């Protein structure tokens with residue numbers, strides 16, 4: 001929940017587009033509160049999670065990372081008189097059904113500005129495009145992770161033991177390509 005191991009981060013967040021065995025989704029989150037025109041980090045409200053695989057003693061049919069994330073928000077007991085920026089850094093973007101659920105949540109929770117930075121776009125069998133547009137329309141800010149966000153997530157969410165962020169090959173190129181794709185998706 002607090003700290004991810006380096007192999008897990010590197011395997012999952014590498015932004016080359018191919019699935020290459022990345023069947024899980026990892027989601028890192030942090031929360032900031034608005035104070036005098038500035039965002040203030042809430043240190044106790046940062047963490048990471050992944051999707052839950054089907055389990056007899058968990059969720060019988062599993063639970064996507066995005067739903068696990070929405071599940072935690074009410075437990076933060078955010079002050080409804082304040083304004084928050086909730087930022088997610090995700091290894092894959094949401095499936096269509098999750099995008100719809102996240103859109104519903106944010107529409108009901110206007111004290112929260114949701115910002116999503118994604119390493120890759122999950123096609124969801126052609127369903128992803130409408131989902132992302134729906135999420136944007138509801139007020140989410142959707143962006144592609146670039147070097148600075150990967151480095152941030154490494155520095156903040158990984159048990160690096162002092163090892164610096166080492167970019168994988170093609171990081172900038174994959175990010176640029178994906179940024180083009182997202183522009184095309186969001187402009188319909």
Ligand SMILES: [Zn+2]
Pocket residue numbers: 064066094095096097098099
């Ligand atoms: Zn989903």
